[PDB]
Amino acid sequence: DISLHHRAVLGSTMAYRETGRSDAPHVLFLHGNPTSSYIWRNIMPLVAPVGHCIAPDLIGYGQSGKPDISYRFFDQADYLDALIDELGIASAYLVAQDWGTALAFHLAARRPQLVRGLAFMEFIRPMRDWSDFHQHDAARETFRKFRTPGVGEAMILDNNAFVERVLPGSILRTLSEEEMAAYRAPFATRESRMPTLMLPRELPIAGEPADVTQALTAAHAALAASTYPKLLFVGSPGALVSPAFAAEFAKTLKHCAVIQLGAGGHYLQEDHPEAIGRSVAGWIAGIEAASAQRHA
């Protein structure tokens, strides 16, 4: 009862997973790099009783198409918007991680009416310099290498280091070979890996690239002035988001609850699917109940 579907969008196709009844509010689950909707498989069933769950594979990821495009942040945003409009989604809760949070922020910034509430974790923000990126020097060095011409191509295009090393390296439990197999399956060819190389090159570090830095600064400003309900999950030590940074960040926002998942790195869904799922489903039930009173 989680089904997979394809729709033609722009110059390609996109796939998504869907579950829950269709008369409930839309809930869009947005993955990051280098995962797919697969990452939300144990969480969607917990949200399905209160929401119509849709979990897209980003263009170039999962079961979505592999068009010949730049795979920049703005391309990812363009294809996700086009899937959303093709599905008729005018109002939704957003649930997101990594580049999925950049996409969510940027989406809420452009369409402030759409957002019924945002649940997010391990998010991206403009980073003034490298010390603002991640929690350990080994991760900075890896991403500096990804961002280096030739070197990055060799690590990710030739050796698939993002899927084969970064991903399992930032998850606490050991993934089954079935699980890894699902994570590597979209990236069997050298060229198919390109979107996984483009994204770390789009991370806004020390003002480069400038277009994404600008876009994510505007989206963080809009997030900060937003009034919709918000839920920030955080792991210890986390990766992009330490616990102390979470508390600090949360108080630049309105209506942002901070939920502690405990021990975790960057991909929190594989370590805490139950906690995330129950938290989000309860949150939606509360927002929907409180909004029905109020509007009565």
Q: Which positions are catalytic?
A: 98, 122, 266
Least distance in angstroms from the C-beta of 41 to a copy of itself? 17
Residues 6+ apart with CB under 8 A from 197: 146, 152, 153, 156, 157, 162
Distance CA 17, CA 111 (A): 23
Distances in Å between the Cα of 185 and the Cα atoms of 5, 50, 129, 233 are: 18, 31, 34, 28
Site mask, a copy of itself, residues 241-260, x = CB under 8 A?
-------------xxxxxxx
Residues 6+ apart with CB under 8 A from 141: none
Check residue 120 for interaction with a copy of itself (CB under 8 A).
Answer: no
Among 91, 189, 227, 252, binds a copy of itself (CB under 8 A): 227
Considering CB distances under 5 to 8 angstroms, the limit depending on partner class, which of Cl ion, a copy of itself, none binds residue 139? none
Position of tokens 């079961």?
Answer: 63
Among 161, 199, 276, 284, binds Cl ion (CB under 5 A): 199
CB 205 within 8 A of CB 148: no
Check residue 273 for interaction with Cl ion (CB under 5 A).
Answer: no
CB 232 within 8 A of CB 120: yes
Per DSSP, which regions of the chain are E strands? 3-9, 12-19, 26-30, 52-56, 92-98, 115-123, 230-237, 256-264
Check residue 283 for interaction with a copy of itself (CB under 8 A).
Answer: yes
Spatial CA neighbour of 189 closest among 27, 60, 79, 10:
60
For residue 237, cis peptide bond before it (omega within 30 degrees of 0): yes
Instruction: Please give the radius of gyration of the chain, using alpha carbons only, rounded to the nearest integer.
Output: 18
Q: Give the interface segment with a copy of itself, choosing from 14-22, 170-178, 208-216, 286-294 (CB under 8 A).
A: 286-294
Check residue 172 for interaction with a copy of itself (CB under 8 A).
Answer: no
Distance CA 242, CA 191 (A): 34
Least distance in angstroms from the C-beta of 40 to Cl ion? 8
Check residue 230 for interaction with Cl ion (CB under 5 A).
Answer: no
Considering CB distances under 5 to 8 angstroms, the limit depending on partner class, which of Cl ion, a copy of itself, none binds residue 287? a copy of itself
Least distance in angstroms from the C-beta of 290 to Cl ion? 27
Check residue 230 for interaction with a copy of itself (CB under 8 A).
Answer: yes
Distance CA 70, CA 194 (A): 9
Check residue 19 for interaction with a copy of itself (CB under 8 A).
Answer: no
Check residue 152 for interaction with Cl ion (CB under 5 A).
Answer: no
Among 17, 26, 31, 201, binds Cl ion (CB under 5 A): 31
**What does 125-143 look like in DSSP terms, one character per residue?**
--BSSGGGS-SSHHHHHHH
Position of tokens 């997979």?
Answer: 4
Site for a copy of itself, residues 98 to 117, rule: CB under 8 A = 117
Query: Count residues contacting a copy of itself (CB under 8 A)?
Result: 35
Among 9, 28, 32, 156, binds Cl ion (CB under 5 A): 32
Q: Give the interface segment with a copy of itself, choosing from 75-83, 142-150, 236-244, 285-293 (CB under 8 A).
A: 285-293
| Residues of this chain that bind a copy of itself (CB under 8 A) | 49-50, 117, 227-231, 254-260, 274-275, 278-294, 296
| Residues of this chain that bind Cl ion (CB under 5 A) | 31-33, 35, 39, 97-98, 199-200
